[PDB]
From a paper:
OP-1156 does not possess a methyl on its pyrrolidine moiety. The ERα LBD-OP-1074 co-crystal complex was solved to 1.55 Å resolution by molecular replacement with one dimer in ASU. Both OP-1154 and OP-1156 were well resolved in the ligand binding pocket. Each molecule participates in similar intermolecular interactions within the hormone-binding pocket by forming hydrogen bonds with its phenolic oxygen and H524, the hydroxyl of the benzyopyran ring and E353, and the nitrogen of the pyrrolidine ring with D351. The greatest differences between the structures of ERα and the OP compounds lie at the pyrrolidine moiety that lies between H3 and H12. OP-1074 and OP-1156 bound ER with the highest affinities, with IC50’s of 7 and 6 nM, respectively, while affinity for OP-1154 was approximately 2-fold lower.
Ligand binding mediates distinct changes in receptor conformation in the ligand binding domain (LBD), leading to differential recruitment of coregulatory molecules, binding to specific response elements, and post-translational modifications, such as receptor degradation.
Numbering used by the authors:
A (entry chain B): 306 to 333, 336 to 337, 341 to 416, 419 to 459, 470 to 547
B (entry chain A): 311 to 333, 336 to 461, 464 to 548
């Protein structure tokens, strides 16, 4: 029934659903990966609660909800990082008390640092709006793991598309500018998927205990009724 | 114009190549046939790219850069396209049509086979048109490596690529409008089509991982090779 929402209501619901910005657990004597892992793990929880507030998401089975999160969790983290890093050229704001440049990024991380920084710059160049950001983040959640259930996801995706066009029309853009900007934003998501892939490779190469959140962890965080 | 754009892309389409003929197939020679096929389609791909409007306007260095980034994606989407009318099978060639069971012979291949098969199914579900296909393939060429290029020349390059990309978007909208779609249906299908590219990028990455794991002499076409094919003389 979350499809009956209007473009205005869709945008409003997403804006309110935005997760908070977290701080790194560092006693402000400067171990970097440890800080990032701790932050990522804590930001995962809020992501799950955010996802539940994305219109149409909880209409899916818990099984399908977990699958989507399994596919999209790193992508969602990255675009979130890029977003809050927009107003800080050449630096990645992992947290308000943890803003790093590519020099600090220097084993195998600098390559991914540069990709993230380039995406942030692109956001900057395009003057990405908050209303557009929440739409793009929602698209990632629903689309990343899509390869009655599948049809519902596409209907939700279509609704977000209508909303993006609505926002751009509201911003005064012409019709040609609207479909052009829509394409530009969606093409950015392909790059974000690319970063997530390379990021996964890099994280696995670190030989940590685990990289991906388990099915049970995601399920538990969802908090079924 | 959008119409001129579509025509140029259609005419630029590379031919469908065949696997060698000898009157049986064996799972041991499978990777060999695919490698042979892939290498031969690479040559035609370079010639295709040169005929993509705006591509040859770029420096040879940046042309090579784009192909390095997109070459596997382009191979995959081409494979998915000609496999579209063949449910449950991948038409690598008219005389080389494989199922996922044959994929099991090569360690790690079924996973990538399934992703390709899923993409073919999506094309089928969406009733993807040939005009739309060539648009998507050109977009891959120009966009895939545009995010991994500070020189003043590079700034000119990226802006040019974005202008070409914008034109292809206009062409897609033109095609769908011509197809009778409403404005809302146009924006929805455009998004649907562009989101598929995210999956294709995903397959290319996983495919690259798989190819490297095979410990062959090389996986990616070298800069000098791409340059050599791209750096034609007069
Ligand atoms: C993008 C970066 C990021 C974004 C937001 C954030 O709050 C923290 C952050 O730090 C990096 C990161 C570090 C570790 C990590 O995985 C640790 C394992 N957890 C992942 C969730 C379950 C278990 C995931 C991401 C992470 C990263 C990802 C890939 C990479 O190659 C380097 C750093
Ligand atoms: C997508 C598949 C494909 C597409 C079109 C085609 O004509 C052949 C084809 O077979 C698979 C393939 C096999 C080998 C290959 O690389 C051989 C190295 N050359 C690549 C270009 C220069 C060197 C690249 C792709 C290839 C594939 C790719 C990744 C993978 O994990 C499994 C099969």
């Amino acid at each position: 029934l979350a499809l009956s929402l209007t473009a205005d209501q869709m945008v409003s619901a997403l804006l309110d659903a935005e997760p908070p910005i977290l701080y790194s657990e560092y006693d402000p004597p400067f171990s970097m990966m440890g800080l990032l892992t701790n932050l990522a793990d804590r930001e995962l929880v809020h992501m799950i609660n955010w996802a539940k507030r994305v219109p149409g998401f909880v209409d899916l089975t818990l099984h399908d909800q977990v699958h989507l999160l399994e596919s999209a969790w790193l992508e969602i983290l990255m675009i979130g990082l890029v977003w809050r890093s927009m107003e800080h050229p050449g630096k990645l704001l992992f947290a308000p008390n943890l803003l790093l440049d590519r020099n600090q990024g220097k084993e195998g991380m600098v390559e991914i640092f540069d990709m993230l920084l380039a995406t942030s710059s692109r956001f900057r160049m395009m003057n990405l709006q908050g209303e557009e950001f929440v739409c793009l983040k929602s698209i990632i959640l629903l689309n990343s793991g899509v390869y009655e259930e599948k049809d519902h996801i596409h209907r939700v995706l279509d609704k977000i598309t209508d909303t993006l066009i609505h926002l751009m029309a509201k911003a005064g853009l012409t019709l040609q500018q609207q479909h052009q900007r829509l394409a530009q934003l969606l093409l950015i998501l392909s790059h974000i998927r690319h970063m997530s892939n390379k990021g996964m490779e890099h994280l696995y190469s670190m030989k940590s205990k685990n990289v991906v959140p388990s099915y049970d962890l995601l399920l538990e965080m969802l908090d079924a009724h």
